[PDB]
Amino acid sequence: SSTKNGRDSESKRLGAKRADGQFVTGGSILYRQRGTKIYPGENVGRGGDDTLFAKIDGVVKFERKGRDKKQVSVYAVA
Amino acid sequence: MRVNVTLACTECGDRNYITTKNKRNNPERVEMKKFCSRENKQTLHRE
RNA sequence: AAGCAGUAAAUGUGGAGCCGUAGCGAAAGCGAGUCUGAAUAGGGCGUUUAGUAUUUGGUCGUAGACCCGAAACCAGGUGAU
RNA sequence: GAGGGUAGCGGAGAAAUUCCAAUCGAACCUGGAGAUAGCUGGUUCUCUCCGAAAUAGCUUUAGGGCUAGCCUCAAGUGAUGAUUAUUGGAGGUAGAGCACUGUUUGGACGAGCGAAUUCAGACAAACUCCGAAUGCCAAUUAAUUUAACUUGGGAGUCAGAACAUGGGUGAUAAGGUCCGUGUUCGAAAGGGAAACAGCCCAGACCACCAGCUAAGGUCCCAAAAU
RNA sequence: GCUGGAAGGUUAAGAGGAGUGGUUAGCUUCUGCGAAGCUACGAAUCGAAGCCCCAGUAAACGGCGGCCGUAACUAUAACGG
RNA sequence: UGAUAUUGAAAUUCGGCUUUCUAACCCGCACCACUUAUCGUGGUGGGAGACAGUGUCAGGCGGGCAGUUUGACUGGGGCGGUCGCCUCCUAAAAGGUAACGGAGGCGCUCAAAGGUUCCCUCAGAAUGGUUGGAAAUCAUUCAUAGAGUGUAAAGGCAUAAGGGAGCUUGACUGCGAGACCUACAAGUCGAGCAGGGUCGAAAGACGGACUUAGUGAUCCGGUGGUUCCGCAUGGAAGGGCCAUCGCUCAACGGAUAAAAGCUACCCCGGGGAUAACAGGCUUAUCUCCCCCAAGAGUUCACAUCGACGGGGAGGUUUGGCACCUCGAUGUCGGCUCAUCGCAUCCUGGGGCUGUAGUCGGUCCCAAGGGUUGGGCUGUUCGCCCAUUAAAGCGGUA
RNA sequence: CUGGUGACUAUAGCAAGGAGGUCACACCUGUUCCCAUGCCGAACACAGAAGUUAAGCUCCUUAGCGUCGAUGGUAGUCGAACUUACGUUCCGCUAGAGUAGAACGUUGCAA
């Protein structure tokens, strides 16, 4: 016979590009996502597609936005 | 149907723009107010 | 370099020419600074600013290019014992 | 029978692709010519150090290439490399569960009531109120060790195989086929499994009629306990 | 496919030269007008065959069908839609 | 087939058509001479005549002939199907990960369905009244999402990204530290600086749409602009730069502007990297042998038969895989010659019986010997005729 | 101890029973004015005689629901040895139960 399946799309590479407690620069990407899985905290912005980037230089900390919610922040340490 | 259109400045130097427009929804020519680089001021664009 | 002299000889003459000493820009052009740009405001490429002639070795290009091997194509001739 | 004619991009054929000097889907000789061959075959002396790959992307591409990965030589920078010990973190697999979407068993509930309401009991790669062991990213933190990075010269490789483990497909078939993660072979000789590339132990610089061990073994072949 | 016909439509080279642009003797608001020569590109109109079109030709190339009911025939249909 | 040159001379209505004439040109037409030759040439008579034939340019027909094209993946090839992009599962809680594995979409749309400032909260259920689905509208209560978000899916959103209203065009210009992905070419996000602005009292927000698909290198050509160049000189033709347009190039990193088939007349270079026969692994299929017992058998499951279900042996059939052989392992039936196994056709030996006797059915041990001749068909196979104690089943390329 | 405004997973909640008002938060009256309605002074905005704790709001009690949650065991699994389902060593779930729990807690007014 034949088949009707077999199609796919190129795999987009999301996830966390920076580790907790790691020094970052002023434009580093912290997280790539669809929708909102991690909220922006202090000194963290949002792009066209929902992506998190740092605004200043410092460490990266993943915090808790209450119940079942999450955020990441950048603190100007040294 | 959609037709690609261009906007030309009026009574001044031309600072062109490109947009899209539906043939039936806007059968006439649209006019807008856009920044002009030559005149360094906002002006009216037609066509 | 060609040429001239010299033993087909290795040596003199010959400074047309070539590379380097300063880059940027499509170009006009400017110049340790140029282009884009209304604006060194930012950005790109530069400020190393030590090369050059010959030769041993490795690799590449043009020539068949490590060697042997076709089925085929074109041109000019020889054949009805 | 003798003398003659028709010549190859051509002749002749009562027609078979039949014949034109033992050869004809297009004769023979010499030149272009050492045509072209991403294809088979072959490639000549000796020692020392190091030592792969059978992968991704694209391809009128699939047994051919190019860039990247992995190997080697030289010149440079100088803890930037690997393993553990202690914290922080992202990410929903095994398992379990029915609070969502679907499936389903038996009783009370008339609006036919094993599901429009309620109490117990089950199922799921494309279900989740929950959630490990490992693995992964960092600290600029401590002991041990020896590597990592950059610029230049030269390559090879793009047919992989078995075993253990998590899966798809097949029929919870295949020495079947396609993926992830390890070992060995490839390119590894020595000992054990009777013989037996991939299984178990173990990595050969050369010489000795010296000792202790591993895997497997100690009645005879056959070294070791009848 | 072959043959016969030209009422209409399409159609080349070649004739045809309405017009456009470049140059400048001169004039002039100063970056425009602009005669004649030389030069580049050209429009209306005319131009055959062929094709579309009309007819014939099959010992030319070719092609020659289904569904549904019914006895003066049990089944089955001379016949009907 | 038409225009034009060789190509002349006169007349008719509106640059010409048509009809006349002879000198150009033509005659494989007659007579004469070179010449005992009509090949050739010349002369004299007839015929046709600016026609034909020839030269240059243009349109049409033209496998008669010539040079080439006719894709890849593929559990061999052909046939069928597919080729670029997006969203899930397989995918083994970082990222990545294949198969002709399992499911769906895309080649858009919106002038408000964009920006800003204010205001608001859904679906569903019950009851009541001119009863159409107590859900076509009027009203009340419960109701954290089951509703909506333009279009598939996933991830999100009730601080709304969901619904309403006012104003407006940021669906701007020149950029851009740093970062993700990555062979390259490409793709993604981005704080901030300057020049104009919209909404808002203001802080502020705004470089299209809740996010992720809606797209095609280069070459060449068209349009608008420009301190650029422009072959002695001033112009111009022609280029450069900036903006934009024209490709189901969908075989979607795109051979060329332009391309289909047969070969049983076939040839060359390679491959067991890849099929057809036999060997090898497996046993779906095939042939046998068992487990339980609903029943049939007048009664009575097991003399004999054995429904619904379950577990094995063998390697004789049809298949699956593609491990040896393509610088060669030669097929189907028949003849000659055999050999091995027992799951036994006859003969020898026993148990049970629904075994009165002669005959029968079923099971157990047993491989010593034996196991027919013809008609049809190339046949293996099968049917038929006549016998026999019997006319057995398989392996050995 | 009442009010204003910020910080932590409902140990902060839902629900039921009680106590309180003229300082404050509320209720309520009215639509000339600053404003508005698919129509609707119901709501948004104003000027404010009265009157009541009914309801919002503050405090107390209730373990009915919801939330948090030990120890022990079990499932699964890193690594090792036999072998193919069983030992040895670490980590350690869901579910179900003993249980915290009717909130702690910063800062300027007021009594």
What topology emerges from the helices and strands here?
The structure is cut from a larger assembly and holds chains A (78 residues) and B (47 residues).
Chain A: E1 29-32, E2 39-40, E3 44-46, E4 51-54, E5 59-64, E6 70-75
Parallel strand pairs in A: 2-6
Antiparallel strand pairs in A: 1-4, 3-4, 5-6
Chain B: E1 2-9, E2 17-22, E3 32-36, E4 41-46
Antiparallel strand pairs in B: 1-2, 1-4, 3-4
The structure holds five RNA strands.
Number of strands of chain A: 6
Helix/strand/pairing category of chain B: mainly beta
> How many structural domains are formed by the residues of chain A?
1
Strand content of chain A: 25-35%
Q: How many β-strand runs of chain B?
A: 4
Q: Could you give the order of strands across the largest sheet of chain A?
A: 1-4-3
Question: What is the 3D shape of chain B?
Answer: elongated
Element pattern of chain A in H and E: EEEEEE
PDB class: ribosome
Keywords: 50S subunit, antibiotic resistance, ribosome
Entry title: 50S ribosomal subunit from Staphylococcus aureus (Strain ATCC43300)
Chain A: 50S ribosomal protein L27
Task: Tag the structure with descriptive keywords.
part of a larger assembly; 2 chains; A: mainly beta; three-stranded antiparallel sheet; about 30% strand; elongated; B: about 45 residues; mainly beta; RNA-binding
